[PDB]
Design a binder for this molecule. Sequence first.
Ligand SMILES: COc1ncnc(NS(=O)(=O)c2ccc(NCC3=Nc4c(nc(N)[nH]c4=O)NC3)cc2)c1OC
Ligand SMILES: COc1ncnc(NS(=O)(=O)c2ccc(NCC3=Nc4c(nc(N)[nH]c4=O)NC3)cc2)c1OC
Ligand SMILES: Nc1ncnc2c1ncn2[C@@H]1O[C@H](COP(=O)(O)OP(=O)(O)OP(=O)(O)O)[C@@H](O)[C@H]1O
Ligand SMILES: Nc1ncnc2c1ncn2[C@@H]1O[C@H](COP(=O)(O)OP(=O)(O)OP(=O)(O)O)[C@@H](O)[C@H]1O
Ligand SMILES: Nc1nc2c(c(=O)[nH]1)N=C(CO)CN2
Ligand SMILES: [Ca+2]
Ligand SMILES: [Mg+2]
Ligand SMILES: [Mg+2]
Ligand SMILES: [Mg+2]
Lengths: 529, 538
Amino acid sequence: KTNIAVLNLGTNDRRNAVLILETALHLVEKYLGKIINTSYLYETVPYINELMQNLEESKYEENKELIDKCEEYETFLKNGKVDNSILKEVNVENYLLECNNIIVKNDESYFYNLTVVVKTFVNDPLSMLVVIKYIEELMIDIDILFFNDFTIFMKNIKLEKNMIYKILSKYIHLEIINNMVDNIEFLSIPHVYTTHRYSILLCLNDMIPEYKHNVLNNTIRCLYNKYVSRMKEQYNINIKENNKRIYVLKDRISYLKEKTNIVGILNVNFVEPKRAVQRMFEMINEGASVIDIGGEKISERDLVVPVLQLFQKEWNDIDAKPIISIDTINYNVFKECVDNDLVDILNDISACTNNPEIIKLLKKKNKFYSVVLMHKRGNPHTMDKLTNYDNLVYDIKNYLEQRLNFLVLNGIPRYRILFDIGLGFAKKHDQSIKLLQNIHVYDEYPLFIGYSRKRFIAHCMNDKDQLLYQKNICGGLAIASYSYYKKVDLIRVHDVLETKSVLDVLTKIDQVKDPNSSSVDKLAAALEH
Amino acid sequence: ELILSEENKTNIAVLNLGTNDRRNAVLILETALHLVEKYLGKIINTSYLYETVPEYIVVNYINELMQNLEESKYEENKELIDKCEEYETFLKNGKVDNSILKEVNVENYLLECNNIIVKNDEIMKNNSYFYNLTVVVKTFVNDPLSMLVVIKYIEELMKRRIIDIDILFFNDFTIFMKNIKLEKNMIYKILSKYIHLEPQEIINNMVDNIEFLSIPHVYTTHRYSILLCLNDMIPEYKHNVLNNTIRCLYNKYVSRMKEQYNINIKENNKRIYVLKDRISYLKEKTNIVGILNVNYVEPKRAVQRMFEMINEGASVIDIGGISERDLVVPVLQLFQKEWNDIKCDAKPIISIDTINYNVFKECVDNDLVDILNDISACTNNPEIIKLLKKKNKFYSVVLMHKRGNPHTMDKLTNYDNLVYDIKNYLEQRLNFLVLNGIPRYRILFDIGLGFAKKHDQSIKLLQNIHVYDEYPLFIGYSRKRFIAHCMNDQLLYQKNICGGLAIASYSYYKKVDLIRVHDVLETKSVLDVLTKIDQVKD
Ligand SMILES: COc1ncnc(NS(=O)(=O)c2ccc(NCC3=Nc4c(nc(N)[nH]c4=O)NC3)cc2)c1OC
Ligand SMILES: COc1ncnc(NS(=O)(=O)c2ccc(NCC3=Nc4c(nc(N)[nH]c4=O)NC3)cc2)c1OC
Ligand SMILES: Nc1ncnc2c1ncn2[C@@H]1O[C@H](COP(=O)(O)OP(=O)(O)OP(=O)(O)O)[C@@H](O)[C@H]1O
Ligand SMILES: Nc1ncnc2c1ncn2[C@@H]1O[C@H](COP(=O)(O)OP(=O)(O)OP(=O)(O)O)[C@@H](O)[C@H]1O
Ligand SMILES: Nc1nc2c(c(=O)[nH]1)N=C(CO)CN2
Ligand SMILES: [Ca+2]
Ligand SMILES: [Mg+2]
Ligand SMILES: [Mg+2]
Ligand SMILES: [Mg+2]
């Protein structure tokens, strides 16, 4: 069989929430099936290196290779046209009354939530839960929110010292042997916490908005939107304030919308690798947190791979390391860099439509890599003419969204996908402005944009060659300011120092010590006479 | 006719001025202000200028006129004053002399007022923006009816709907007189009391025109544009015939139309300030003011720089200073000559950054400047305030906050409530200029970044710039040291300029009226792009 398995992942260690939660994912890819959906990483309010190069192999092979549909997943969503459970089913009232009891028994730091959908070979929840629990020990808490359309309840189980073997044998080519049983007292599906823990309902809204379990009184979106709605008028809380969406560039947490990172452009396009590493160094000094390297006679690979090499050396010569992204659509170039640890991010200006296979290089059995998906049409010679859009803003958004869905169906972690509207690519000047005017449409999403030096900036101003050069750099800093206030996550610029300076001042003006001083100081003045 | 009473009394009167001529509003209204100053008494308060939505339902002969006015029989006194007792009495509104004209009571007043409204609404019901301004006059005219006569003369002089001047209040009087007819000779007699008459057919027109008299003016309570103006001047004031203070009335009016009508009465009733001779809508544009520091020998280089800065996009040049006079006047005199060699309203507004009466006197006499930028807020030599007023010319002024002088002011850094202390100071400086006849809408506020302010304090003043949302705001941050203190070998130079451009952006979003800058082209490029981003094509 193949079932649809919705897990919920967890951790506490901020410094390593990545390292941990990502490993939980490799295992889930290995031992239960294929990850076909993840959600955003979230921060919520209520040695391990070596381990990898030796672990028991799964009783199945992995399909690294791509897919565009999943019928089982699709059944699941609708749902319920699946073979009957291999375990005792339970009614509406049966479940409603039993759920309550489990809650009050348990009635008597930061949390990091990350749902997942799994195409699973495993036969049933219980069997799943065993495969899971074993997983936990090998290393963090991994629930099951759903298993097909099952309304399951089972109240007591003890299991063997060999049974554990025999289930964990059916799936895995194998002191912790018994360690599991005092914990596996229970199995509720849907999980009990499901309607109650907000972090959960928040991870689900990413993945399965339109879902509806029968033992649930509305859809996961209409459930989510009621939690948020009510927790505002009832308690007067804004619940998103303390539950913050995360995205990851290398290995660290980044809170969506809380910074505008500078991405320094290094464009190698007779030319001299020694300089290009000096320029990288400069850039780091000047404020850049990312360097975007690209070439695009002799080859892309020759222009880019050495320079990244010289760099990777000279950095060991001398951990505030610049994040490195490569501006490439070339599968092979990216394969090298990634096999050689030369880069952290793929900047793919074709949103990985040049060579969808490139997505495969974004995983290893231990490491994930983040990607910039950019929208364009055609190439630099034709794109100027490729300017008709039905609904400019939304067409580009939907394009990027579909594009993300694809990587995510192929187990590229959502939180590692960045969107880029691609300013100046198959856009008239007024269309580049309209996109900026409307950038709020990306408020839910990690956003990366590149306005720097582009022709449209010039157009908005209406020796004489060098005046326009200067005005163009100057005009850019307006867009940096705009970007700062619209809270764009990354901006791709040639002029780091000027950009950093501007972002520095803007940051200060905004750094308030006391958020009520404004109204307090006003009231004091009005009582002074 | 105890109307010609020998007795020299001092009254308080509140006037309303309106015109429909957008392109000439300043000149129309400022012409009226001059004639009010000339014929009625002392202007001791004014509101902002407003562009207002008509509330009917509830060009160059002026320059000749000003050359040919009859003399007032009352002296002009330009001396500065700090206080006006009659005005404080008016506001309170305690004991004043009795009304020469006969009063009605409230019940009676409201009946006759109310009457006139319905009647009037009807007339208009069966059937272009206003430019409004109110004024407080300390007046030597004996009574409202007498004042109205003189007002009507002024309205005639100003013709060949150009100007409407109404009496809103006069002391604490409640008056409603229904069928005035006034002898042609009585008009002459009243006019002659107050004016050396040297213009006869005019007195014929006036007899028709004065038919009743209502104090308060009938519309006072009914017309937004009128309450808008009053709220500026006398928010605390309460006439006996009014349910509440001007501010309560004003606030209620704004509330009512939000509920009963869902209107937002503010959107199309715009506050105006005035830099030279044209209308600026408050908060509608961030103007660049280019800095010219003559700190030299050679003026020709300075005038080229001036011309550069215009091309670079500055709409105001702020010039500052071997005499300060010797540094500055040549440059402005050269510039004026080099500009006249030349395209007529591409000329920058010129401000002179000076606290020195003698220097500003000479500039103004030789039509060299438009604006005084007085960094002491005219506290150094308030006599300079006399120089802001001519016979047919008002000059605008920037009032900036600081303490001490450049050697002292780095240790005068202690404030109880930085943001409001400074705001209160500027508000008091404005009250002083306004009490002394400077139009409220010609005065610009400047918090004085970097003067008797630690860096943190400069930032703090910028974080809370919102406090000046109701007022014309001028700031100068350019290249000051606080900017550098805010970020992590001309590096310092560049990073400093770069940081300025951040503050240009902030200024843009906070809708600061004027930013005073060294780097014009860079600043202009930034504001051009920000403007375009805001410009929705639909
Ligand atoms: C006739 O020739 C021309 N035809 C069209 N446009 C031209 N100029 S352009 O200024 O509008 C302009 C400049 C540079 C670009 N691309 C630079 C990049 N931009 C991005 C990137 N990656 C990501 N993720 N996002 C990016 O915006 N990589 C490279 C695009 C448009 C142009 O002149 C050079
Ligand atoms: C040890 O020396 C020093 N100590 C403290 N601060 C110094 N410099 S500073 O950066 O803070 C600075 C720079 C220039 C100024 N003044 C220039 C002006 N500023 C304005 C104006 N007019 C109007 N209306 N508004 C204005 O802000 N005119 C001139 C004030 C402070 C400083 O260096 C000379
Ligand atoms: N849907 C479910 N998925 C997993 N375990 C479940 C489920 N329903 C009931 N259980 C039981 O509840 C236990 C929960 O312990 P676990 O350490 O896995 O953390 P948890 O589910 O986050 O809850 P808690 O930390 O409060 O115990 C499981 O060991 C199992 O016996
Ligand atoms: N307090 C007052 N101030 C001015 N005019 C007054 C006052 N009380 C009564 N009036 C009378 O109202 C007349 C209105 O004439 P005016 O030329 O100002 O017309 P208007 O402004 O179009 O009038 P209204 O405001 O009544 O619609 C005056 O000529 C005068 O006779
Ligand atoms: N806003 C506004 N509306 C009016 C005004 C005026 O001055 N301002 N004057 C009127 C009659 O003269 C009629 N309506
Ligand atoms: Ca006078
Ligand atoms: Mg669990
Ligand atoms: Mg009139
Ligand atoms: Mg009138």
